[PDB]
């Protein structure tokens, strides 16, 4: 997990998955690395969700650097197969970006606040 | 029984097995009353019993000619009075009315949602022709099933 | 069908002397036509201390005067002791490849 | 890898069914091929409008022949002891679990293959 920086508690990962599920059902979502990267470049995305089991790693290795330089929060998940299925796909998805949560705004910002403690002490 | 659409508590079923009626006559009887109300079907079938009107024949219609009592169901002027076949269908509908009474359904609002005839069982006998030859004298039985709904 | 005859043929072909390639070609004959030689014919067509290379079996009909070295696939047991009793030597086709004089031998005859 | 659809996708395959497979049900239900031999047979004579005969020129490219459509080499596995004999590694095989293995051994068989990194067809 070279591209993975900071360990995340498991009680937080499952909250990301159910955030994407509601975001899929009441908002705009972009699936796949080729589309999340364009989301950061156009600065249209607000959350970036990265799996921790991609292989090889260079598909999503560029996201952590390209996202933090533009000041956009990002979160990790243990598995890509669950991440893909939460988005309504029958296949795994390596990365997901959220355009507008809609009715899921109330808890995505909760994710943003909680991850700050883990990345705040990372120096 | 076929249907898996209407709720089970709104249906009444019956079957009558191995009766001396042909699927050739019962194909047309079952097709004429399919989808009728029970009250309309029962009173139409009784008019055929005393030959007030004819029952149409669509498929196995050799030996049946044209009637003066046919304009409702189009392409056929050919009809007849299959008495022995009608009497068994009336007996089947009596059994199905009783089963709907037990479930507590409204008899005045019952509809024939499914009816079909099937091949039953054959009794195998033989005749005695001229010149010492022998042929068949079979007897074909049949089943009939019905489902009543609202 | 023999496991050791097959591994012997594959190593003779790798040799860089036309004598050994001809032996491998000759050992691929149908079994019913495989080559053999008797002692009496080796005696007639050789001199003392020669080298005879037989691509088959050496059988014991006839007698031997002079000592010779004979290289063959197999020897009849009566035929093997006829050769040794007259002062000769016996080798197998497997050992003849590795022998240092048989690396660059001279006065070698191929017989059948 | 890119040489998998250059031979397959444009060339839709012939079925090579026996003569008169559509006139009689006793012949059509077998769904197999049998060589024509009649003196007047028309597939034997190769007349126009008559469904090609089987020939050796119809083979596939040798470099893709017999591969799984994912591009790997299929291996039928009937026991957990067949996994320990993995050749080369997980890079070039796809595992086909046997159909008759019961559900209790399947749980342990799939776990063993997952940690080795192998790819499973009927997972």
């Amino acid at each position: 997990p070279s591209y993975v920086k900071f360990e995340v508690p498991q009680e937080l990962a499952d909250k990301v998955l159910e955030a994407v599920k509601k975001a899929k059902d009441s908002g705009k979502i972009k699936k796949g690395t080729n589309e999340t990267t364009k989301a950061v470049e156009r600065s249209q995305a607000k959350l970036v969700v990265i799996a921790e089991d991609v292989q090889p790693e260079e598909i999503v290795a560029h996201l952590p650097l390209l996202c933090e330089e533009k000041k956009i929060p990002y979160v990790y998940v243990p598995s890509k197969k669950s991440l893909g299925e939460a988005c309504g796909l029958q296949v795994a998805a390596a990365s997901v970006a959220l355009m507008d949560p809609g009715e899921a705004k109330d808890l995505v910002d909760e994710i943003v606040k909680r991850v700050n403690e883990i990345k705040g002490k990372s120096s | 029984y076929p249907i898996l659409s209407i709720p089970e508590d709104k249906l009444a079923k019956a079957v009558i097995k191995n009766i001396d009626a042909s699927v050739r006559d019962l194909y047309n009887v079952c097709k004429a009353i399919r989808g009728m109300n029970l009250k309309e079907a029962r009173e139409f079938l009784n008019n055929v019993l005393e030959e007030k009107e004819a029952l149409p024949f669509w498929r196995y219609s050799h030996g049946t000619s044209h009637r003066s009592n046919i304009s409702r169901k189009w392409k056929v002027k050919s009809g007849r009075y299959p008495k022995k076949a009608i009497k068994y269908v009336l007996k089947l509908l009596d059994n199905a009315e009783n089963n709907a009474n037990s479930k507590g359904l409204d008899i005045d609002n019952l509809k024939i949602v499914h009816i079909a005839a099937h091949k039953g069982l054959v009794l195998k006998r033989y005749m005695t022709r001229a010149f010492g030859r022998s042929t068949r004298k079979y007897k074909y039985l049949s089943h009939i099933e019905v489902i009543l709904g609202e | 069908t023999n496991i050791m005859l097959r591994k012997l043929i594959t190593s003779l072909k790798k040799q860089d002397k036309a004598i050994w390639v001809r032996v491998a070609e000759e050992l691929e004959a149908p079994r019913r036509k495989r080559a053999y030689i008797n002692i009496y014919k080796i005696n007639r067509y050789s001199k003392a201390n020669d080298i005879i290379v037989v691509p088959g079996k050496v059988l014991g009909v006839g007698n031997l005067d002079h000592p010779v070295t004979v290289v063959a696939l197999s020897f009849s047991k009566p035929a093997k002791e006829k050769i040794l009793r007259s002062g000769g030597k016996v080798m197998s086709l497997y050992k003849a490849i590795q022998e240092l004089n048989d690396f660059k031998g001279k006065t070698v005859r191929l017989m059948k | 890898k890119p040489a998998k659809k250059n031979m397959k996708s444009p060339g839709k395959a012939i079925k090579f069914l026996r003569f008169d497979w559509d006139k009689y049900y006793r012949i059509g239900r077998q769904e197999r091929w049998r060589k024509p031999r009649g003196i007047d047979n028309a597939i034997r004579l190769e007349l126009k409008g008559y469904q090609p005969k089987v020939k050796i020129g119809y083979r596939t490219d040798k470099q893709i022949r017999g591969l799984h459509p994912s591009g790997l080499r299929p291996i039928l596995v009937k026991s957990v002891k067949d996994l320990e004999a993995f050749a080369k590694g997980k890079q070039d095989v796809i595992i086909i679990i046997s159909s008759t293995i019961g559900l209790r051994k399947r749980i342990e068989l799939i776990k063993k293959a997952e940690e080795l990194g192998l790819k499973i067809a009927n997972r």
């Binding site: 998955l17 159910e18 669950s82 | - | - | 559900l103």
Partner: protein, 70 residues
């Protein structure tokens, strides 16, 4: 095979989608989570002999394993 009721189909929200699980009818309990071995098999229709359990009737500690999946 389903007439022996060792396999149970889970009704996920009345949808044209039923999830097949292995139900250990032993263990003698009434709300334990280990009675359910989750397969990954989404049926498109319900077989005649299948036994159906509603999604709300499952123990709450197995519903999480399926609602993430859903």
């Amino acid at each position: 095979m389903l007439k022996h009721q060792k396999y149970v189909y889970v009704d996920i929200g009345d949808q044209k989608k039923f999830l097949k699980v292995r139900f250990l009818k032993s263990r003698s309990e009434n709300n334990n989570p280990e009675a359910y071995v989750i397969l990954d098999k989404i049926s498109i229709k319900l077989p005649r002999n299948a036994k159906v359990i509603k999604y709300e009737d499952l123990p709450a500690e197995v519903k999480d394993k399926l609602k993430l999946k859903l």
